Amino acid sequence: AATDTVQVGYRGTAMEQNYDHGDLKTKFAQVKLPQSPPPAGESPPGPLPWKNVQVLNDISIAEFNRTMIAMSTWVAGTGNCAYCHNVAAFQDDTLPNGKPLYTKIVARRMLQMTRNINGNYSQHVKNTGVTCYTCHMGKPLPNGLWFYSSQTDYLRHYLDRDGARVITQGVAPSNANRSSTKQAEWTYALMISQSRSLGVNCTYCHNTRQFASWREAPPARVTAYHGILMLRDVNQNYLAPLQPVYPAVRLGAMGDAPKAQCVTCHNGAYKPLYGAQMAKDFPAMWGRADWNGVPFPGI
Amino acid sequence: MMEYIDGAQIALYAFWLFFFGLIIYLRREDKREGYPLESPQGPRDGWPKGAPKKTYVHRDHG
Amino acid sequence: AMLSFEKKYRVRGGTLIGGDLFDFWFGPFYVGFFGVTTIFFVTLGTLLCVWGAAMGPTWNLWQINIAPPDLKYGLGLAPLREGGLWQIITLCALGAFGSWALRQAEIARKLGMGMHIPWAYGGAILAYTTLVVIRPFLLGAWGHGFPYGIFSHLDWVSNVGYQYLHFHYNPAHMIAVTFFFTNCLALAMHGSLILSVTNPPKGTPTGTSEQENVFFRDLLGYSIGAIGIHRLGLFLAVGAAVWSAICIVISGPFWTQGWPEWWNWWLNLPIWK
Amino acid sequence: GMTEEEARRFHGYMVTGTLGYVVVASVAHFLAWSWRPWF
Amino acid sequence: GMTEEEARRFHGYMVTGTLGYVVVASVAHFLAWSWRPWF
Amino acid sequence: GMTEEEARRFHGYMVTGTLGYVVVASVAHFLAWSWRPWF
Amino acid sequence: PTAWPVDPTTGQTLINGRPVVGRVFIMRKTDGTVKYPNVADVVAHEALAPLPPVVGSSYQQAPITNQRRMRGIMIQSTLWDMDRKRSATRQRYYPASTPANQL
Amino acid sequence: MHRIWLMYDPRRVMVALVGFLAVLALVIHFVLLSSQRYSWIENGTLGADQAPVGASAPAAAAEMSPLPPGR
Amino acid sequence: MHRIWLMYDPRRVMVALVGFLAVLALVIHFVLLSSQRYSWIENGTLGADQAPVGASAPAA
Amino acid sequence: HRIWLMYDPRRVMVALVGFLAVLALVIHFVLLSSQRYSWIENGTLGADQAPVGAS
Amino acid sequence: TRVQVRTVPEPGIFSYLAGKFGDAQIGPIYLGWAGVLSLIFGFIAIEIIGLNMWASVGWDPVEFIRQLPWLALEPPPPQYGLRVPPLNQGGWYLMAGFFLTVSIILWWIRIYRRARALQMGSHLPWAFASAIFLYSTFFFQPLLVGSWSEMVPFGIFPHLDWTSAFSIRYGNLYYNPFHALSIAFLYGSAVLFAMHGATILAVARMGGEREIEQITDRGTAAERSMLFWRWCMGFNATMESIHRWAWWFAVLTTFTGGIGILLTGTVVDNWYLWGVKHGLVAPYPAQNQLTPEQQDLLRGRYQGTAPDSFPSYVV
Ligand SMILES: CCCCCCCCCCCCCC(=O)OC[C@H](COP(=O)(O)OCC(O)COP(=O)(O)OC[C@@H](COC(=O)CCCCCCCCCCCCC)OC(=O)CCCCCCCCCCCCC)OC(=O)CCCCCCCCCCCCC
Ligand code: BCL
Ligand SMILES: CC[C@H]1c2cc3[nH]c4c(c3C)C(=O)[C@H](C(=O)OC)c4c3nc(cc4[nH]c(cc(n2)[C@@H]1C)c(C(C)=O)c4C)[C@@H](C)[C@@H]3CCC(=O)OC/C=C(\C)CCC[C@H](C)CCC[C@H](C)CCCC(C)C
Ligand SMILES: CC[C@H]1c2cc3[nH]c4c(c3C)C(=O)[C@H](C(=O)OC)c4c3nc(cc4[nH]c(cc(n2)[C@@H]1C)c(C(C)=O)c4C)[C@@H](C)[C@@H]3CCC(=O)OC/C=C(\C)CCC[C@H](C)CCC[C@H](C)CCCC(C)C
Ligand SMILES: *[C@H]1O[C@H](CO)[C@@H](O[C@@H]2O[C@@H](C)[C@H](O)[C@@H](O)[C@H]2O)[C@H](O)[C@@H]1O[C@H]1O[C@H](C(=O)O)[C@@H](O[C@H]2O[C@H](CO)[C@@H](O)[C@H](O)[C@H]2NC(C)=O)[C@H](OC(C)=O)[C@H]1OC(C)=O
Ligand SMILES: *[C@H]1O[C@H](CO)[C@@H](O[C@@H]2O[C@@H](C)[C@H](O)[C@@H](O)[C@H]2O)[C@H](O)[C@@H]1O[C@H]1O[C@H](C(=O)O)[C@@H](O[C@H]2O[C@H](CO)[C@@H](O)[C@H](O)[C@H]2NC(C)=O)[C@H](OC(C)=O)[C@H]1OC(C)=O
Ligand SMILES: COC(C)(C)C/C=C/C(C)=C/C=C/C(C=O)=C/C=C/C(C)=C/C=C/C=C(C)/C=C/C=C(\C)CC/C=C(C)/C=C/C=C(\C)C(=O)O
Ligand SMILES: COC(C)(C)C/C=C/C(C)=C/C=C/C(C=O)=C/C=C/C(C)=C/C=C/C=C(C)/C=C/C=C(\C)CC/C=C(C)/C=C/C=C(\C)C(=O)O
Ligand SMILES: COC(C)(C)C/C=C/C(C)=C/C=C/C(C=O)=C/C=C/C(C)=C/C=C/C=C(C)/C=C/C=C(\C)CC/C=C(C)/C=C/C=C(\C)C(=O)O
Ligand SMILES: COC(C)(C)C/C=C/C(C)=C/C=C/C(C)=C/C=C/C(C)=C/C=C\C=C(C)\C=C\C=C(C)\C=C\C=C(C)\C=C\CC(C)(C)OC
Ligand SMILES: [Fe+3]
DSSP states (O other), X not given: OOEEEEEOSSTTSOOEEEEEHHXXXXXXXXXXXXXXXXXXXXXXXXXXXXXXXXXXXTSOHHHHHHHHHHHIIIIIOTTOGGGTSOTTXXXXXXXXXXXXXXXXXXXXXXXXXXXXXXXHOXXXXXXXXXXXXHHHTTSSSOSOOBOOOOTTOXXXXXXXXXXXXXXXXXXXXXXXXXXXXHHHHHHHHHXXXXXXXXXXXXXXXXXXXXXXXXXXXXXXXXXXXXXXHHHHHHIIIIIGGGTTTSOGGGSOTTSOOOBOOHHHHHTTSSSGGGGOOOGGGOGGGOOSSEETTEEOOOO | OOSSOOHHHHHHHHHHHHHHHHHXXXXXXXXXXXXXXXXXXXXXXXXXXXXXXXXXXXXXXX | OXXXXXXGGOOSOOOSSSTTSSOOEEXXXXXXXXXHHHHHHHHHXXXXXXXXXXXXXXXXXTTOOBOOOOGGGTTSOOOGGGTHHHHHHHHHHHHHHHHHHHHHHHHHHHHTOOTHHHHHHHHHHHHHHIIIXXXXXXXXXXXXXXXXXXXXXXXXXXXXXXXXXXXXXOHHHHHHHHHHHHHHHHHHHHHHHHHHHHSOSTTSOOOOHHHHHHHHHHHHSXXXXXXXXXXHHHHHHHHHHHHHHHHHHSBTTTBOSOSXXXXXXXXXXXXXX | OOXXXXXXXXXXXXXXHHHHHHHHHHXXXXXXXXXXXXX | OOOXXXXXXHHHHXXXXXXXXXXXXXXHHHHHHHHSOOO | OOOHHHXXXXXXXXXXXXXXXXXXXXXXXXXXXXXXXXX | OOSOOBOTTTOOBEETTEEOSSOOOOOOSGGGOOOXXXXXXXXXXXXXXXXXXXXXXXXXXXXXXXSBSOOOTTHHHHTTTTOOOHHHHHTTBOOOOOOGGGO | OTTHHHHSOHHHHHHHHHHHHHXXXXXXXXXXXXXXXXXXXXXXXXXXXXXXXXXXXXXXXTTOOSSOOOO | OTTHHHHSOHXXXXXXXXXXXXXXXXXXXXXXXXXXXXXXXXXXXXXXXXXXXXXXOOOO | OOHHHHSOHXXXXXXXXXXXXXXXXXHHHHXXXXXXXXXXXXXXXXXXXXXXXXO | OOOOOOOSSOTTOOOOOOEEETTEEESSOOOHHHHHHHHHHHHHHHHHHHHHHHHHTXXXXXXXXXXXXXXOBOOOOGGGTTSOOOIIIIIHHHHHHHHHHHHHHHHHHHHHHHHHHTTOOSHHHHHHHHHHHXXXXXXXXXXXXXXXXXXXXXXXXXXXXXXXXXXXXXXXXGGOHHHHHHHXXXXXXXXXXXXXXXXXXXXXXXXXXXXXHHHHSOXXXXXXXXXXXHHHHSOOOOTTHHHHHHHHHHHHHHHHHHHHHHHBTTTBSOHHHHHHHTTOOOOOOOSOOOOHHHHHHSOOBBOOOOOOSOOOOOO
């Protein structure tokens, strides 16, 4: 019933984050206790035996096996190789019936997506990085899935739209900015969603005396902006084109593929998994030559 | 053209001149009773000088 | 100097503490023991404000900003340049505001008046004490108080509001605003009615209680009466400050989510869940 | 104000209504327990 | 006003009613402790 | 109102009640101590 | 240049070539705050002005089943994040509507 | 001790007493109902060994924190 | 014990009694209706073994 | 003691009882909010299992 | 208290007089022709708003009550400017706004005529005219910026959404000096009515609430009221002139408010930057610092049109 407070700005500005202490302990325990333990590494020699491996070309055979154990733990349950594979023939991309193993097709794309996130969007995920667990939480469906609805849905800021600014960078009115008050309402709706997705308030990213200011805002605002650019890449190039792959039970009413948003990783916390650092333990997923100076164990 | 001057600043000083004019008016009205003041050095009006005492006429029933 | 009827009223008595020792006037002002303590706290607090301005970046009146300490200091007295000066000024303010209310009680007692004015002013002191004492104490740091600066405290109000995403949805804030707006309407209405009977159009007799009663009944559909409108004005003005104190003390100590999602209880009433 | 004669007659009904209410509530609880016990 | 004649009889009812209530509550705690003890 | 004889007899039961309360509190503390000491 | 020269023999700070008795510090106002010179200086520290909006050439109506009944701009955050009653959720969009001859 | 009723009006004491006992009973029931261990409507059928118990301590990974970094 | 109805007016008490019982009964029904275990309008036809139960201690 | 001649026992009794009730509730809620003495959830723990603050 | 009198024949020479004060009829609550028309026009405005709100939940009467404070009748889309919009996209809004505005003006006339009939000064209709002035700036400012989309939506929480978004769009309304002045008069109105209400109740024992008698024939209740404030704060009003202080503080709330709205978006588009220009903004230490590459990277776009298609990404 006590309130925890974190100061995030200068004295007396009231740039502060408030947390109900009992609720936060509960949410935190419900992450730590289910947090999956990682198997330890190895370093064997030799050339690769694989028949139909297309992304994980660059890691040892032991690292590959350890990765597959992690993926099943993170998406399907600790032993559930049958979720993706014809267990009689791991190289298959089809069932014995000939029908495609769509989960394996998706998982191959999810590997490329995760390497793209960790490699190209280090300005967002830094050295925490993401793994399959960050979205999936041990389950096939992440949180925060969204589909086409109406034209003015603000979640399309994370897909095809660009531009949320409404404030004028000058004293006098000009033709440079003709933003409506309705557009300020739309940005305000978008920004409530981001605040809720992280379990923070507006002062985490702004000094609300001037929402346009970057100098007065905490550095987290710059990280947040890279999160928008990352989601546009993730949605447009990886999640949305999987439309022909899924069964129709996964698709929206418009027949579109499920798309991600801030809450999909963050799940209401200021960092995903309260900043648990798992990606450093799984070189298969880095998309980098080194993780925090630790070099990639190539082949 | 004038950079520092702008219409919001012009409007605000127009309001200030009106507002101080209004405070003077109200303080004149506040002195229709109890003035001039008594003092050991003689009568005193303060500032602004009060408006005069005001006589009221009542509706004739005769 | 004295009003032409005043000297008659300047008797001893009605003091609370000092007896006859401070029971005197200075120009128009009554002194008394709480006059002495008032001027002490006013002078100390003001000079420490001027010192806070002097060690700050500018003398521009609008930009002066004596800020509270960082939250890390908790309920301790911080270093003076780090916000301990704000804490001393806050004690001086409480001393001044309390002394002012008690001095008003001595003046009312000396004139044979009821204590309505001291108690009405207590509604403002309650709201101030909630902002700088009670809510910071419940949050566990004096650093939650608002900064002393003509615009910098508006930056604080802005950021506190957005700590709850959409502060308009605070239900106690909606009531407090309604009291403030209704008070201002009621003040315009009562002020206009008294003036318009006492200042009828030129060449017209001075109006009567009956006329303002007739007109007021046409405005609201009931007659409030002469004492009733003053009870109403006191209720609205003081109720506004009390609901203001409630609306800020529930924000943080008791509610910590966005204010919009507080309304989830209304959407889930079982008649329509 | 009431007489003791009326208070006697009132209390008889009052206690009897209390008993009837307690009886019905006891059947209601045993039905509920039989359907879905809470311990 | 209250008399000594009223007061001594009233004290009998209060004390007996209080002790009766505390006895019923004692059994309720006996039942609760048997179901899910708190130490 | 009050008298010295009322004060005397009131004081008697007041001291008795205070002792009774302090006895019960002392047992409650020693039960709590035995369960979970605070030093 | 952020500190004055130090005499290496005594360890004293030298200000304008002459020693100071004491440990010298550079004076600053509260927390290093500095008055904002003007709007142009404030804007020089910000990002560049936003780019012009992307505006569509022409408007294509959505299917009527994708048109919101409620035109309030913030409704998706202020109500629909928390409200998930089935009947109310159905009322959010217009129902299907077809010319009778096409049935 | 009956002279306590000469001091305090018996008719009014009963109303004060019942009011206190009603409030206290409701306060204790709602405190218990809000707890994990005694949320008896949802979990009353659990055995005493299966009912929740508070932790001997909470735990964490060294890089995790429940609160964001501040100052 | 009927002498208690010389102290307290039956008119006042029987209104207060009916009011208290009605409020208490209604509070309990809505508390139960809001629970998972006893949301009987949706789930009243489930058998006792099928009805929800709150989470046990893991103890591990 | 003659102290009951100074102060009305009929007032002091109520003031004392009210003071004790406030103090008793404060101490219970302080303890209930602590880690070590949150007895409703953790009361069945043994004294060597119960929480202790950092050394 | 609790010795009320009750008067069976008519007071004014419980019950009420049927009669005349010259031109003024007494008895019924006065409407006249302007009052009747005001109620007709205003009723149609209320009906249009409610029927649009109810239609927006698909006529569901349960959702109409459940969702009521979120329901809106919403202004036209921005790209129409001042042109007539489609009926479902703000045409009903402008129609309700028109009838509401006429209804308000007819109510002002009704009040103005009644004051003159009762042979009273014109103070109340000019006070009401200050409130109507602020109201009308929610028409004139959208007109001056050139789009009815900028108008206030009819709806409990929706008009508060607009109030926040207006301050956001124009760069924080706290730095608008006429908003700041309007708040000073709003607070001052609460200060004055607290002080005055408490003052008159404090002398009501001495007949101080009979204010018209105390104005025309100063009693000891007036003298004590003046001396309390003179002794407290060094200056005082009179029993009349305290009502002038009251009148002006209420009137200046909405008058200075209206000027602040009319200036917004027409003369100043960012009030915080106007505050910086004019020296209102207190300095704080920088919370972040951008590199020159970030100053180009972190500029966004101004918000545009919503996407009118559902792209496939067939790849
Ligand atoms: C003037 C020409 C230009 C004009 C254009 C610009 C200004 C327009 C306003 C002009 C107003 C009149 C000024 C004046 O000279 O007044 C003399 C009179 C004193 O009473 P009196 O009846 O007239 O005279 C009797 C006296 O002469 C003889 O009796 P005695 O010998 O016993 O009196 C001792 C004297 C000594 O005289 C003085 O000390 C004069 C002090 C004037 C102080 C003004 C300060 C203003 C700047 C403050 C900056 C801040 C400093 C911290 O009288 C006294 O003891 C003084 C009694 C009055 C105490 C006033 C206390 C403060 C009032 C509020 C201050 C403003 C708060 C925002 O004092 C007063 O009546 C002052 C209070 C009246 C105005 C209150 C207005 C409040 C508006 C609040 C809303 C603001 C919204 C933004
Ligand atoms: C995030 C939100 C923004 C903000 C945005 C705005 C906006 C936008 C406006 C205000 C305005 C006002 N704000 Mg601001 N405001 C904020 C913070 C504050 C704070 C604070 C402690 O933080 C306070 C005290 C205030 C106070 C005030 C008032 C001084 C002022 C309104 C005066 C008035 O009487 O209006 C109430 C009176 C009226 C609206 C007049 C109504 C009269 C008409 C005739 C009534 C008709 C009734 C009709 C017939 C009834 C039937 C209707 C149908 C049901 C539809 N604001 C922040 C910075 N504020 C207004 C102003 O003047 O700005 C300069 C304004 O427009
Ligand atoms: C409770 C209902 C409303 C109310 C009523 C009210 N106010 C009252 C009264 C009443 C009934 C009085 O009798 C009393 C009075 O005497 O009025 C003339 C008063 C009063 N209301 C005042 C102001 C005031 N009231 C406000 C509000 C309200 N007053 C409520 C809305 C506000 C707001 C909202 O901002 C202000 C500014 C004073 C004019 C006066 C009390 C005078 C007093 O206490 O004097 C002694 C103290 C000083 C002269 C100065 C003290 C200086 C300090 C030691 C240092 C500064 C510290 C301060 C915290 C700095 C703040 C800086 C700001 C930029 C943030
Ligand atoms: C000085 C500034 C303050 C101010 C002042 C003020 N307001 C005023 C006045 C004054 C001095 C008035 O004299 C005037 C008034 O009448 O007061 C009672 C008014 C008024 N201020 C109002 C509201 C108001 N004032 C506000 C604010 C303010 N008012 C400021 C704070 C606010 C806010 C804060 O938002 C509101 C909402 C109104 C109560 C009133 C003006 C009433 C009016 O114009 O009504 C027009 C008519 C209608 C709305 C239609 C009603 C329709 C019926 C409900 C239908 C019933 C059926 C009908 C019978 C059918 C027709 C059949 C026919 C045959 C009859
Ligand atoms: C699913 O189908 C794919 C091919 O579509 C099989 O993949 C094999 O291994 C790949 C490395 C290789 O690239 C690919 O060419 C293929 O050799 C995968 O093993 C699964 O196979 C089963 O389904 C096959 C299918 O395509 O439907 C089926 O193939 C046979 O039957 C289809 C008609 O139903 C006919 O078009 C094929 O020509 C025919 N091919 C063969 C080699 O028989 C497989 O049947 C057999 C015996 O292989 C299925 O395999 C099993 C064990 O059931
Ligand atoms: C569907 O179409 C609309 C309308 O163009 C697109 O909305 C545009 O982009 C939004 C982000 C923005 O908010 C909105 O103002 C509007 O500018 C919407 O995103 C969908 O886009 C896809 O379809 C576009 C289309 O108009 O058909 C298509 O656009 C390209 O092709 C059309 C001809 O079919 C031509 O008129 C356009 O100029 C052309 N634009 C570009 C930038 O090439 C999009 O194609 C591309 C590459 O953008 C479609 O996008 C995708 C990923 O399918
Ligand atoms: C979610 O879990 C939570 C809920 C939180 C857990 C907590 C639970 C808690 C704290 C529960 C508390 C329960 C409680 C406490 O008091 C319960 C007490 C209940 C009681 C007292 C019930 C009494 C009922 C009595 C009735 C119905 C009487 C009927 C009388 C009748 C029919 C007679 C009619 C005829 C008359 C009168 C004729 C008179 C003759 C006349 C006039 C003549 O003859 O003249
Ligand atoms: C969340 O956990 C937290 C809260 C934190 C934990 C802490 C909790 C704390 C601190 C609890 C403290 C509890 C407490 C402390 O003392 C509790 C004290 C309780 C007490 C005193 C109960 C007393 C009950 C007495 C009763 C029921 C009496 C009934 C009398 C009857 C029936 C007689 C009626 C007869 C009549 C009227 C006839 C009269 C004669 C007539 C008419 C005639 O003669 O004519
Ligand atoms: C952060 O703070 C943290 C650390 C958390 C906390 C801090 C805690 C601190 C600092 C606590 C301090 C506690 C304290 C200090 O002294 C506490 C002092 C406690 C005391 C004194 C208790 C006294 C109790 C006395 C009782 C119960 C008396 C009962 C009397 C009865 C029953 C008699 C009734 C009436 C009669 C017989 C009259 C009828 C006869 C009549 C009329 C006749 O005969 O005529
Ligand atoms: C069957 O009857 C039912 C049940 C439907 C009746 C019930 C109705 C209900 C429940 C109604 C509820 C109404 C509510 C809750 C209303 C809330 C309103 C609020 C809070 C409004 C707040 C602010 C609104 C403002 C400021 C609006 C201002 C609009 C203006 C100034 C518009 C002016 C338009 C003009 C002057 C002219 C337009 C026409 C032109 C000249 C442009 O020509 C096209
Ligand atoms: Fe008055």
